[PDB]
Write a protein that binds this ligand. Structure first.
Ligand code: ZN
Lengths: 49, 397, 397
C-alpha cells in the first residue's frame, strides 16, 4: 500500500534492510507491510521508526 | 506453558498441513510461524529428565529455515520438514514427560522442569501461536482470574465409598433399619431398608435420607435419576461396623414413595425435584440430598401379606432404592471422566519410569485418595499436569 | 478496585502531605498525581446507593487543578485542597459503602456496584498509584494467580462448637467416658474424662483423641499448647445428647499423660509433638489431632485413694485436658481475627442501612455460619468486601 516512515534516515535504513539477502523473511515481508495510523479525529498520528 | 502449547500446535499443524503436493497458499502462514520458531529456538540448549528412570537427554537446536519459494510443495521440502518436525516432536515429548512427572507443594501452577522454566522467558515468547484447545483456554483464563468451565462426560466427582448405616440395630441383626450406598464415579446408588416394613413407624411411613457432599461445585449437570437401585436388591451377607460378625440381607423391593432430590449450594436449595424421574437438570450445586421414604402398602394380596408379619421373624426385608447418574457436567476445577484419557497418560508416565512418591500426589496416583482430599495445591498441580498431558496427547498419540 | 485504592491512597496522602507551610519538594510528586486524578475524573457522573436504606447520591466532578507554583504551601492552597479532598473523600466513602453491601453468587470477585463497574475502565486507569497495603497487594497477586498470605493475630478459624462425646454411657449417667471440647476463635479446649479412672481399662490407661478439621490451610502458625483445660475442670450439669435429661460432672484433674499433637495436611503428618508444652510451631496444616491419654496413678496417698474406689459410686471423676491457642498464623484466604476491624466495618455497614439477606452471606453476617460453610464463592465475596473495607478504613477512620 502507501507507507510513511518518520525520517529520511529511517527510510534509508528501511530500504537497506529490505534490499539485502540476509534478513528474515517475516521481517523483509513486514517492512513492506507496516502502516501509519493517522486519525483526523482525536488529533493523533502513529508512525513507524 | 503457552509456548509449549504453541510448539505442539505448530508441530501438529506442520504434520497436517505440510504434505506432498499441497498448494503453497494453504501453508503460507504456517511456514512463517515455523521459521519464527526455528529462529527463536536456535542457539539454545536444553536438558530433560533426571528423576526416576527418565533418562537425561541434552537438546541442541541448529536448523536451517524452510524454503518459501515453491508453488506446490514437492517431496524434498516434505522430507526436510519431516526431519525438523521429528526432532522437535521428540524434544517436546521429553519436555512434557519431564513436566508431568514433577510437582511442588509451594506453588504448583509454576513450571517445575528446567526446560519449561527456560521456555518461560520473553526470548521464547515469539514462539507463541493460537491457544484453541480447551485446557490451554482455561489455563489462559485462570491466569487472569476469570471464570472457566471444563465439560466432562460422566465425571469422577465421587470417591469410591461403599458403606452403610444402621439407624436401628442390635447384635441379633434380625430387625435392622437404615441406608446403604455406593458412590462410584458419577453414580450414586442408595437404598434404605427396614426389616419391619414400618409396621410400628408412625403412619406406616419410614423416612430415609442420604446427603452426598461434593468436593467441587458442579454446574449445569444433566442427571439420570431412576428408582430401584439395582445393586442393593439381591440377598447378601455383610460384615458389621466393627467387622466382627456378618448379617444377612434378603430384600424385597418397594417403590420409593415421596422422592425429594435437592441440589444444595452453600446450604441453599437451588433445584428440587419431587417424585420426578428420568433425566433431570441441576444448574449449580455442591451437595446432593436424596430424601425418599418407605410406606407400608395398606392393601396387600395374600401373596404379599405372608411376607410382612406383625411378629419378629422377617425372612423378607423391605428395601427402597434410588440411582443418580451424572451424565455430563461443567466443573471449574479439573477432574477425570470417561471421555478424556489425560489421567491415564499422567499415570502411565509416572508408572513407566518408576517415579518416587512426592509430597503432593497420592502414592500410585490413587484417584480415590486424590478426590477424597482435593486440596487447592493438589488442584493446581493436577491442572498443570493435565494441561501438559493434553499438550503431549496432541503430539504423541 | 485498583483505581479505588489509588483514589483513597492519594486522598490519604493529600490529607497527610499537603499541609500549611510545608516545602513544595515534599509534595511535588503528589500534586502531579492529584492533578492527573482531577483531569481523569472531570466530566464523569456517578450514582451510588440504592439498596436498603442507603440513599441514592449523584456525583458530578467539575474541579480546577491545583497550583504548582509555590515554594512553601500557604493556607489558600491548603483550603482549596481541603475542599477538593473532602468532596472526593465523600465520593469514595459512598462508593465503598455501595460496594461492601452488594454480593453475587456467580462471580463475586467482580465489582458489583455501578460506580465501581464504571471505574473499572481504562479511561480511569491513569488514576492508578502505588498498591502498598496488604489487602491490595494480595488482591493484585491473586489477580495473577500467585501465592498470597494474610498474617493474622489470633485468627477466627474455628467455628463456635461447644459439645461433647460419650464413648461409654448409660441412662443412669454414673459411669461415663469420653471427650468434651470448646472450639472458639483461635482456641481449642479439650478434656477427656473417665468416671472409673481406668480401673478396668487395659494397663490402667484410657486413650482419648480429638481431631479438628480446618476449613482453610494455615501456614507458619505459632501455637501456645498448655495442659489442663480450665473450662472443663469445675463441676457442672449438662444436658444429654437428645436434650432429654441432665447429667452431673464433678471433675478432679490428672495431668495429661503421653500428649501427641499432630498437624495433618492431606492426611500426612507434617509436624508432631510428643509431651512438649509451651509455644510450638506448625508450619503447614489443615487438621489438628490431639492424642492424650489418662493413666491411673499407681501410687496414691490416702487422700487420693478415697477418691477412686473399685466399686460403682464415683463422686470424683477423672478428667484430663489440653488447651491449644493459635496466637498468629499466615492464611492464604481471608479470615477474621482479634487485630483487624474489617469484619466489624462490613457488619456495621450492612446493619446500619437495614440490608436484606442476599444469596451468599449468612443472615446477620453470622461468622460462625460463614466459617462453618466457607465456600469458594463466599470466599471470593468475603475477600472483595474485606478489600473494600480496608480501603474505606484507610479513608474513613
Ligand atoms: Zn459415553
Amino acid at each position: 500500500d502507501a507507507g510513511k516512515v518518520v525520517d529520511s534516515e529511517t527510510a534509508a535504513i528501511c530500504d537497506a534492510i529490505f534490499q539485502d539477502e540476509e534478513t528474515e523473511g517475516a521481517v523483509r515481508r513486514f517492512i513492506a507491510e507496516m502502516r501509519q495510523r493517522v486519525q483526523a479525529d482525536r488529533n493523533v498520528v502513529n508512525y513507524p521508526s | 506453558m503457552d509456548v509449549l502449547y504453541s510448539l505442539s500446535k505448530t508441530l501438529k499443524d506442520a504434520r497436517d498441513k505440510i504434505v506432498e503436493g499441497t498448494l503453497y497458499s494453504n501453508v503460507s502462514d504456517l511456514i512463517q510461524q515455523f521459521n519464527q520458531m526455528i529462529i527463536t529456538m536456535n542457539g539454545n540448549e536444553f536438558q530433560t529428565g533426571g528423576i526416576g528412570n527418565l533418562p537425561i537427554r541434552n537438546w541442541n537446536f541448529n536448523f536451517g529455515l524452510l524454503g518459501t519459494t515453491l508453488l506446490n510443495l514437492d517431496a524434498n521440502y516434505v522430507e526436510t520438514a519431516r526431519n525438523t518436525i521429528d526432532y522437535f516432536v521428540d524434544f517436546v515429548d521429553n519436555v512434557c514427560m519431564d513436566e508431568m512427572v514433577r510437582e511442588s507443594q509451594r506453588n504448583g501452577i509454576a513450571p517445575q522442569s528446567d526446560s519449561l522454566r527456560k521456555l518461560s522467558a520473553i526470548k521464547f515468547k515469539r514462539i507463541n501461536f493460537d491457544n484453541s484447545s480447551e485446557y490451554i483456554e482455561n489455563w489462559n483464563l485462570q491466569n487472569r482470574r476469570q471464570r472457566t468451565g471444563f465439560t466432562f462426560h460422566k465425571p469422577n466427582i465421587f470417591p469410591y465409598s461403599a458403606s452403610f448405616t444402621l439407624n436401628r440395630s442390635q447384635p441379633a441383626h434380625d430387625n435392622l433399619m437404615g441406608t446403604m450406598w455406593l458412590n462410584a464415579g458419577s453414580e450414586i446408588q442408595v437404598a434404605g431398608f427396614d426389616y419391619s416394613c414400618a409396621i410400628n413407624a408412625p403412619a406406616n411411613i419410614q423416612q430415609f435420607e442420604h446427603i452426598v457432599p461434593l468436593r467441587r461445585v458442579l454446574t449445569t449437570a444433566t442427571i439420570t435419576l431412576l428408582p430401584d437401585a439395582e445393586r442393593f436388591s439381591f440377598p447378601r451377607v455383610i460384615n458389621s461396623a466393627d467387622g466382627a460378625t456378618t448379617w444377612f440381607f434378603n430384600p424385597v423391593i418397594l417403590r420409593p414413595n415421596n422422592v425429594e432430590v435437592e441440589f444444595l449450594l452453600n446450604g441453599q436449595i437451588i433445584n428440587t425435584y419431587q417424585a420426578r424421574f428420568g433425566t433431570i437438570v441441576a444448574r449449580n450445586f455442591d451437595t446432593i440430598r436424596l430424601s425418599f421414604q418407605l410406606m407400608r402398602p395398606p392393601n396387600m394380596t395374600p401373596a404379599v401379606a405372608v411376607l410382612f408379619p406383625n411378629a419378629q421373624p422377617f425372612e423378607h426385608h423391605a428395601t427402597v432404592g434410588l440411582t443418580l447418574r451424572i451424565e455430563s457436567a461443567v466443573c471449574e476445577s479439573v477432574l477425570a471422566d470417561a471421555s478424556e484419557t489425560l489421567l491415564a497418560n499422567v499415570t502411565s508416565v509416572r508408572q513407566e519410569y518408576a517415579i518416587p512418591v512426592g509430597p503432593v500426589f497420592p502414592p500410585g496416583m490413587n484417584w480415590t485418595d486424590l478426590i477424597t482430599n482435593y486440596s487447592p495445591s493438589r488442584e493446581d498441580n493436577l491442572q498443570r499436569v493435565f494441561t501438559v498431558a493434553s499438550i503431549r496427547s496432541m503430539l504423541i498419540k
